[PDB]
């Protein structure tokens, strides 16, 4: 995705937030720069972008920049963006989460059960060229008690993982109900 | 060139029945004549084997009834090859049986002239389809195919 971005300076952060202009910082191991973008555009973008799908920032210089959101500070009391750190990529391998799509319903949910998708993404080290939009997961043999670790995984072509292999990607959990309260009323 | 007053839906075996409820209150206070009415009703069930045929009744203005024999219930066709007299209490986690779609095909040929559904390629999934709410799945071979 692409998005308009402007250069920042000694202007009041608070006043800029008043103007709806969300503050930000574009940087890598070489660059470090104060910037600011528009909030309304940042919303419609981030709803579909997030840290996963890469974004390209625009500048008055005409420079397009292969950025990536590393973190976004949030203000308390009704969730809302405060500030945004942009990681301008390069070409060398660099860590970032990648989404997941648990295709096919498990055995547990069918016979009454709930999918407790632990990880909605997986942190893997990868080159700026390899950007898998989603990694399929053949979850189906799972019952309301079994689980899927990072061990068994649709590991992408030429893409290693950074997180520990024993890390639990997902699991299935029992459906609680009113009949549970019967025992809960006793003990 | 025919009269009507109150359509009514009663289920009873093709050859054996009695004025007992719910067939009773259906034609007890409405007044029925089991002298010539059943003497034409038993005829349409004489050669036909046993079932739970839902003869779609439609009580005339002259206290008669339309004994047009419609095809047996959807529940009746699936539990045929299984030997069951019922089905799964909760069709989701449970499954009393699992007949193939091969039994589904040829038994659906006795559930089509009364149906307005055209071909059997559409009539089979009507049988195997209601079965998924009954407590029984299927396994076939041709299906989608494509190219």
């Amino acid at each position: 995705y692409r998005l308009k971005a402007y250069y920042r300076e000694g202007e009041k952060p608070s006043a800029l937030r008043r103007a709806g202009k969300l503050p930000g910082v574009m940087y890598n191991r070489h660059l470090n720069r104060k910037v600011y973008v528009d909030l309304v555009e940042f919303d419609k973008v981030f709803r579909q972008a997030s840290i996963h799908h890469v974004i390209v920032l625009e500048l008055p210089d005409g420079q397009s920049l292969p950025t990536l959101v590393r973190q976004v500070n949030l203000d308390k009391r009704r969730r809302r963006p405060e500030h945004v750190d942009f990681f301008v990529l390069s070409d060398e391998p660099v860590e970032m989460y990648v989404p997941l799509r648990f295709v096919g319903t498990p055995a547990g949910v069918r016979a009454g059960g709930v999918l407790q998708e632990i990880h909605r993404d997986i942190l893997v080290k990868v080159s700026p060229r390899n950007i898998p939009e989603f990694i399929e997961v053949d979850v189906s043999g799972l019952e309301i008690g079994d689980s899927l670790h990072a061990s068994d995984l649709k590991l992408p072509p030429g893409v290693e993982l950074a997180v520990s292999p024993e890390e639990t990607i997902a699991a299935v959990v029992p459906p609680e109900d009113v009949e549970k309260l019967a025992e809960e009323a006793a003990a | 060139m025919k009269k009507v007053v109150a359509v009514v839906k009663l289920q009873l075996p093709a050859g054996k029945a009695t004025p007992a409820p719910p067939v009773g209150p259906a034609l007890g206070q409405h007044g029925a004549n089991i002298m010539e009415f059943v003497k034409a009703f038993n005829a349409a069930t004489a050669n036909m084997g046993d079932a739970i045929v839902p003869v779609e009744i439609t009580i005339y203005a002259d206290r008669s009834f339309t004994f047009v024999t419609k095809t047996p219930p959807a529940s009746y066709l699936i539990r045929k090859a299984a030997g069951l007299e019922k089905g799964a209490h909760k069709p989701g986690r449970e499954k009393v049986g699992r007949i193939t779609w091969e039994q589904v095909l040829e038994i659906a040929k006795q559930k089509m002239p009364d149906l307005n559904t055209t071909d059997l390629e559409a009539a089979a999934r009507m049988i195997a389809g209601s079965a998924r709410s009954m407590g029984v799945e299927v396994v076939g071979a041709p299906e989608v195919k494509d190219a």
Binding site: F46, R47, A49, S50, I51, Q71, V72, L74, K76, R77, R78, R79, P81, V109, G112, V114, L115, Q116, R120, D121, V173, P174, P175, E176, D177, V178, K180, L181 | -
Partner: protein, 134 residues
């Protein structure tokens, strides 16, 4: 629980740590006013949710009572009150993520957390997932 004995009151300042983000589940319930949620109210809202949909998904409770409520037997002024008449309470500052839900559709979760909102001494606020992770 274990700890040791009763505990002071202490004023709840600004919603500093009283503010998070949906970790588990789809939708979520969030606060807007500072409050001491009793150990009764939590179970009241939980049982309200499980009462709404039966054999539903799974309910989370990202808050927990551990602050000893005190109380005197309606008398004068001898020492601190033994209390626990309300038992324990949970300090919740505006925006703190409280109750999560999953495995249920929009209307189920919406209506459920809506019911949970009235079983509470706070003005509540239901929230989706948005996209803002970590």
């Amino acid at each position: 629980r274990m700890k040791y004995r009763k505990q002071q009151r202490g004023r709840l300042k600004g919603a500093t740590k009283g503010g998070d983000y949906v970790a588990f589940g789809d939708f979520g319930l969030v606060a807007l006013e500072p409050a001491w949620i009793t150990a009764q109210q939590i179970e009241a809202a939980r049982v309200a949710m499980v009462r709404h949909f039966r054999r539903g998904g799974k309910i989370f409770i990202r808050i927990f009572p551990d602050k000893p409520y005190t109380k005197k037997p309606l008398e004068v002024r001898m020492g601190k009150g033994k209390g626990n008449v309300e038992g324990y309470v949970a300090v919740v500052k505006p925006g703190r993520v409280m109750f999560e839900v999953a495995g249920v559709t929009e209307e189920q979760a919406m209506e459920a957390l809506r019911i949970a909102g009235h079983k509470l001494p706070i003005k509540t606020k239901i929230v989706r997932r948005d996209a803002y992770d970590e």
